[PDB]
Design a protein around this ligand. Structure first.
Ligand SMILES: CN1CCN(C(=O)c2ccc(Nc3nc(-c4cccc(NC(=O)c5ccc(C(C)(C)C)cc5)c4)cn4ccnc34)cc2)CC1
Length: 263
């Protein structure tokens, strides 16, 4: 529990599923992002209880939760600040003129965070480039893991809703609501495709409905030009029709390090 006397609000960063997010300072010293949770957007009591568990998730490649303010409304969520913003927008800026080693490093940053979450049996459920952030040194960190469980917007939480992450979901999520470690693995493969495509929308010429149908028939995203055959094999391994045949994050991390050494 952070005392709100220790927070100063300095700039507005944007608006997300729970409303406004601000940049500010904690204890007059530390840069932070602060979500101001909009009334009616969140299942607040359930979140408040989970926040205690989320304070225990700490890894160099996960956005660090510093604390919450819950003795007031709106609730605040205070995290480490990520100065370069959303990974998706970062990938789409042509000025960065990324080398493919830098793209693989972004995939490794995410895989490390996810290997840690997997070790804690903690699902993200909305892993995608739009939910990763980039710091001032270009390191990518995974953001907002687990928060999907507290969203009160049926367009987001329903498989048939307009905001559901259809293009990052395996067939067993879309057809049966079967969520598992292996649905985050599928989404990770789509995120590597976003990275190597410099932020293209997955299945860029299809609708959400058409994507669900394409994948149910065994077809998959094509290799992005910048991906070698080895990089493509890693992302494609995440999309096996049988969930239990998809790798773990520990295996994907080993595969990525092997490609780094080879290429
Ligand atoms: C190109 N330049 C670099 C970036 N830039 C920016 O304006 C800019 C710079 C830093 C930014 N940083 C952060 N931005 C945010 C942020 C801002 C707006 C919206 C959101 N999104 C959310 O709060 C949000 C996202 C997903 C979810 C669910 C539950 C659906 C998974 C719930 C909530 C986050 C969070 N952060 C946590 C730590 N750092 C940041 C955001 C924007 C412009 C200049």
């Amino acid at each position: 529990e952070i005392d709100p006397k220790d927070l100063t609000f300095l700039k507005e960063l944007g608006t997300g599923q729970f409303g406004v997010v601000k940049y500010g300072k904690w204890r007059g010293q530390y840069d932070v992002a602060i979500k101001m949770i909009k009334e009616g957007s969140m299942s607040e009591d359930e979140f408040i209880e989970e926040a205690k568990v989320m304070m225990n998730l700490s890894h160099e490649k996960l956005v660090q939760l510093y604390g919450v303010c819950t003795k007031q409304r709106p609730i605040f969520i205070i995290t480490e600040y990520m100065a370069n913003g959303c990974l998706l927008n970062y990938l789409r800026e042509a000025r960065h003129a990324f080398q493919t080693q830098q793209l693989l490093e972004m995939c490794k940053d995410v895989c490390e965070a996810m290997e840690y979450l997997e070790s804690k049996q903690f699902l993200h459920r909305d892993l995608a480039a739009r939910n990763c952030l980039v710091n001032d040194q270009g390191v990518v960190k995974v953001s907002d893991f687990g928060l999907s469980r507290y969203v009160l917007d049926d367009e987001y939480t329903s498989s048939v809703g307009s905001k559901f992450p259809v293009r990052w979901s395996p067939p067993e999520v879309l057809m049966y609501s079967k969520f598992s470690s292996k649905s985050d693995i599928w989404a990770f493969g789509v995120l590597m495709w976003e990275i190597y495509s410099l932020g293209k929308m997955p299945y860029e010429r299809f609708t959400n409905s058409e994507t669900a149908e394409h994948i149910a028939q065994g077809l998959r995203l094509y290799r992005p030009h910048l991906a070698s055959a080895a990089v493509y094999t890693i992302m494609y391994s995440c999309w096996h029709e049988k969930a239990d045949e998809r790798p773990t994050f520990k295996i994907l991390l080993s595969n990525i390090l092997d490609v780094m050494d080879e290429e």
